[PDB]
Subunit: 721 residues, 2 copies
């Protein structure tokens, strides 16, 4: 009663969502009040003012222009701040009371579909997490693509590997979640009510959204813990969008058995997309990525993060890439003009697509027939299958050309989007507007343009499933064409898959180093087999002991993304997990951090695992480090029976081949001719018994007695041993 | 212009052509690359903003001549302008000349008038001198054989051979000083150094186009009269600059709350040149103890003094500005109150320092009368330079006392705040410390620093440091060296009591070197340097020594390095060694004693005690750390089996 009718309406609207900020449309500004005005002034840096106190109560107020809202939304999403958007639904002149305002959408870091808020080559994801005594249910939704996934990771360590791989911009969780260490520090962190994670409500909700009576159609019925998170995520997405989500037409279970399980730590060391420094330079992706479209880059980045294990999918991709290699020069320019179809289709599905997006959609439709013509000559069963999957949609292109001008404006607010004569009534209203060169006829024309603009979505709504299938094939083709182009330019050769685990490489060249090094990369062959599983690496510092191992792992990863390899020939055996340990500096004390990942390597690793221990035995006491690494390799080669490329400074771990089977010493050797040392960066058998250090002692010579005394001591140490 | 450029063709020239000093041909190309000004060949920059571009070029070590006839040559060595000078870092100018007998190295601090000379015996000493001076500019002769030391230095200048003739130098140095014989400064018996001095004096004269009366003396820096720190040791102790190149977490950052930048520079010079004579140190300590009671009163008055030493040199060069004169008159106003506070103090050096500062009351009256139209003010300071010239020698003595007093007061304030106690000097070369506290970490760490005693003697010369990483294995040795260095600067020490023995050289080989000369080559180069130039009076701090890529290879080198350091060199050492095979040295070699910092393990928590004790931890914090975030119990058990095997075989 004390509040004026406009504030009474706002107070109830804020009461619906009191834990999140709200943008309330008034005139041309979204006004924030009281505590919200205070927070906005702190982050958006907008002036905090006070709304005039006609009621008498002070109302702290802040306002931002509607046309520049996206910039403020970007600032909030970086801070992980959820914001609700509310708009005037009724016409204010007709409404005697405050105009009926409703929350149109809730902008949350997870459900941002606006292109302005999305990095082009990075996928945005929304996920929720739930904990049962038995295990954890983790769900993920790519709202920007409609891609929906689910998983049930067995333990806390798996939860961390999944959380880094997904890197969710927003994470939902429950008040009862016990392990708050993993949850804390995540951006856009949300706590939720217990009732949202009920299994029965989820079973009905998922079936209703899909339209399928049984989730058995997607093989998710046997995993209830994950479904509970999915239902909350689906409800949260439905609540955040306030609309149906037809594009989210399927659920998939990401099976640990069907993919290479890379620990979060291995991912940072490989520098797959982001370096240890946090840069996007010297990455495996930049060397492997010269793709024309962002959709292809994201699919490539997803492929890198999720290497597939099934042989059939790999054999299908390689044959296609080899066939496409001849036409790659013709294919790359046409695919560039396709545009961001996957995000454009999701915006169309949400009815939030803009005319510029529609121009790219029709433009992609124009590129499809030429692609079909070039693909028809290519003789491969998958290439023809991809050609069929794209579809024609020529009638829809004709409809779009008829219903949109060739170069449309960004906003439908000012019109001039529909091509003339699509609607005889539209041209009739436009004729009155051009007659002067009438405000009611201008409004009639604009409202008709908006009504037809809604109809354009309705015309394309039935084919949305086919259009989504088309975008899946086009991005899929872009990756295959790029891998062929890179293979032709960087002389990559296809690697055969063999039944037994084991990697054999000939003339192996590390991809990132060879591209970024002016001096030639000296290539080295490597062999891993049931017998050649363990290689101890020794040699001079700055001798690239670390790079030799990185080359093998990146080659092994590339083999499982289905691409060619920077070697004359590669032979690869099935691999379940890739483990990497590199101890370089304190992050827990350095040794504690080194031990934590190593403990994980000692339990998780299995016969199909590839391990890359580096600088192990960095134990502060030489006796202490020697005891742990010597046992760690022995356990890695006695029970785990994994493949390892141990990089060890220790010269006492070079006696392993005599004591243990499967170990083989290999050393990168720097040559010394006269008084000059050279870095060969090449791999040779065994190790340099007389280290470069004695010769280095002669360079910038220490007193001759001192160098002689060392020779006496080195002879004494080896002889006593 | 072509004739003017021909006179100095090896350096850039600013040619006055309106505000824009127009540069042409190759000079225009270089200016476009560095000043980032568009190349049109010709380039130009405004006369009023010349100082900003000069600063950009000086950082790059590019000498520039200024012509209006060349009026002056602005070179990185002779930058007297305050805008081009870091307030708390010394700027120097030096030349180097090579004879078959040895090398002659000269240095001139143009910003103080302090002129020094030396004849280092070999190439390794030249590098130590070059880094200590860090000369922003270095002059050398076309015949110089060892170009490895010269190349990579900023402001590198090649010079004609005739400039390095001994006869011209003997006459030139005598003429500038006005003394018939250089025997008055004891430099006559060192001709190789004098040749460099003459070129440097001529170069300074050529660069300024004027006489240099402030340069009234030359001194021979005798290796016997100072502690000789090698270039590498200086980078590791982070005395003024950290390994990262920052000015943070430095011994200077903790020891420097000086009220005037001159005091910081004098402190930095004292740190860079520790004195060996006991009398100068006993004089300083008695003064600091007497000042400790009045430190609170002394600090505010000394802050108002200003940068007198650089102001006097600018006054001497006739390049001082009125803002500097306001600080000079202000310092003159502060002197009587200082004399009043110092008069009550009962100490022989404090009264001697009081006499050295003097009154200069007539000069203060003249300055108050002559300072509160740029041409009129410029005329005024030029007149003032002439008036203050006869007393310039006394004023230079006054700035030496004022900066010296600021250092003693700052050290007393630090002593009062951080409970520093004076260290007595002993004839025998041994360092005994009680409740020793490392200065930097106790001043940047929230949790309490745990202090530890250390003993070094003719018998306790070598200490092997072992124990956990992140256990301050490195910090303990750094604490002793910084204390030993601080004892020879004459300051109090962060401990209950310190006893110090005479030290000729401080050598350090800090570890963790992963920068490419390969890393191991750089590592042995500094070790080779120590084992050739170390003596009985040397204090050595090998750290992470024996980081040979092959553990067997590194073990032979470090084990031998220690044996040579304790059989012939007989120096004092604080070896920090990861190797647990160097813990057997006390049985094998006399003079070695094991000391270890051990993080304790009680229940499921590790505590960083940072406490020093005799012996070493056979069971490392790592076996306990293996239990935390536990590896499979069999794996940790297998390490115990191996740890028992490794120690038992030894
Ligand atoms: N095969 C190679 N051919 C040529 N240069 C190489 C090769 N491998 C490495 N390098 C170079 O040598 C350097 C070695 O650095 P790094 O791999 O960190 O050495 P280490 O692992 O021995 O410490 C690399 O930065 C790279 O420039
Ligand atoms: N007495 C002390 N008590 C607690 N922490 C300390 C103490 N002395 C130093 N530290 C802290 O512990 C750290 C140990 O790391 P670091 O000095 O790199 O180890 P190390 O000297 O073995 O290389 C120091 O950097 C400092 O932050």
């Amino acid at each position: 009663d004390a509040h004026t009718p406009m504030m009474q309406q706002y107070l109830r609207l804020k009461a619906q969502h009191p834990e999140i900020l709200l943008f309330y449309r008034m005139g041309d500004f979204y006004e924030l009040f009281y505590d919200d005005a205070k927070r906005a002034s702190q982050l958006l840096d907008i002036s905090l003012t006070k709304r005039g106190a006609s009621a008498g109560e002070p109302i702290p107020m802040a306002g931002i222009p509607y046309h520049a809202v996206e910039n403020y939304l970007a600032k909030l999403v970086n801070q992980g701040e959820s914001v609700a958007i509310c708009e005037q639904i009724g016409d204010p002149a007709t409404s005697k009371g405050p105009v009926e305002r409703k929350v149109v959408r809730i902008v949350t870091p997870g459900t941002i579909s606006d292109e302005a808020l999305l990095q082009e080559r990075q996928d945005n994801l929304l996920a929720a997490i739930w904990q049962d005594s038995k295990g954890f249910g983790y769900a993920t939704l790519d709202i920007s693509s409609g891609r929906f996934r689910l998983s049930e990771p067995a333990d806390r360590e798996t939860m961390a590997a999944e959380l880094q791989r997904t890197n969710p911009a927003e994470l939902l969780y429950a008040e009862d979640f016990a392990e708050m260490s993993l949850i804390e520090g995540r951006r856009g962190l949300r706590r939720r009510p217990l009732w949202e994670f009920e299994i029965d409500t989820a079973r009905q909700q998922l079936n209703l959204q899909f339209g399928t009576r049984d989730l058995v159609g997607f093989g998710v019925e046997n995993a209830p813990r994950g479904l509970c998170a999915a239902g909350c995520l689906l409800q949260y997405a439905k609540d955040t969008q306030r609309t149906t989500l037809p594009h989210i037409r399927s659920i998939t279970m990401e099976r640990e058995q069907d993919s290479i399980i890379m620990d979060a730590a291995t991912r940072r060391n490989l520098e797959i997309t982001q370096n240890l420094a946090g840069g996007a330079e010297n990455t495996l992706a930049s060397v492997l990525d010269c793709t024309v479209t962002p959709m292809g880059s994201r699919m490539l980045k997803r492929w890198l993060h999720m290497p597939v294990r099934d042989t059939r999918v790999l054999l299908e991709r390689q044959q296609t890439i080899g066939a496409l290699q001849d036409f790659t020069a013709g294919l790359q320019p046409v695919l560039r003009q396709v545009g961001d179809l996957e995000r454009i289709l999701a915006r169309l599905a949400l009815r939030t697509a803009r005319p510029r997006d529609l121009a790219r959609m029709r433009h992609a439709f124009q590129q499809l027939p030429e692609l079909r013509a070039q693909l028809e000559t290519v003789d491969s069963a998958p290439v023809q299958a991809l050609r069929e999957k794209m579809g024609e949609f020529a009638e829809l292109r004709d409809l779009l050309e008829r219903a949109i001008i060739d170069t449309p404006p960004v906003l439908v607010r000012d019109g001039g989007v529909i091509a003339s004569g699509y609607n005889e009534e539209l041209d009739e209203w436009r004729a009155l507007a051009d007659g002067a060169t009438v405000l009611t006829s201008k409004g009639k024309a604009l409202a008709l343009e908006k009504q037809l603009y809604e109809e354009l979505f309705d015309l394309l709504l039935p084919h949305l499933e086919a259009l989504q299938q088309s975008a899946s094939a086009l991005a899929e083709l872009d990756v295959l064409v790029n891998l062929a182009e890179r293979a032709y330019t960087l002389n990559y050769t296809c690697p055969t898959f063999i039944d037994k685990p084991g990697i054999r490489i000939t003339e192996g060249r590390h991809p990132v180093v060879e591209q970024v090094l002016n001096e030639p990369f000296i290539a080295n062959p490597l062999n891993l087999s049931p017998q050649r599983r363990m290689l101890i690496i020794t040699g001079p510092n700055m001798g690239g002991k670390s790079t030799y191992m990185r080359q093998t792992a990146l080659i092994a990863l590339m083999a499982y993304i289905g691409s060619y390899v920077p070697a004359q020939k590669v032979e690869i055996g099935p691999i379940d997990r890739i483990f990497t340990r590199v101890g370089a500096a304190d992050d827990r004390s350095t040794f504690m951090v080194e031990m934590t990942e190593t403990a994980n390597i000692l339990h998780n690793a299995t016969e199909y695992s590839l391990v890359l221990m580096d600088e192990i035995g960095r134990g502060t006491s030489t006796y202490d480090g020697l005891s742990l690494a010597w046992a760690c390799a022995e356990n890695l080669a006695n029970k785990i029976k994994a493949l390892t490329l141990f990089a060890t400074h220790y010269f006492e771990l070079t006696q392993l081949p005599e004591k243990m089977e499967g170990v083989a010493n290999v050393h990168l050797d720097a040559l010394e001719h006269g008084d000059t040392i050279a870095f060969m960066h090449s791999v040779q058998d065994g190790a340099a018994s007389k280290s470069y250090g004695l010769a280095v002692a002669a360079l910038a010579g220490v007193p001759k007695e001192v160098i002689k005394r060392a020779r006496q001591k080195l002879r004494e140490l080896e002889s006593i041993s």
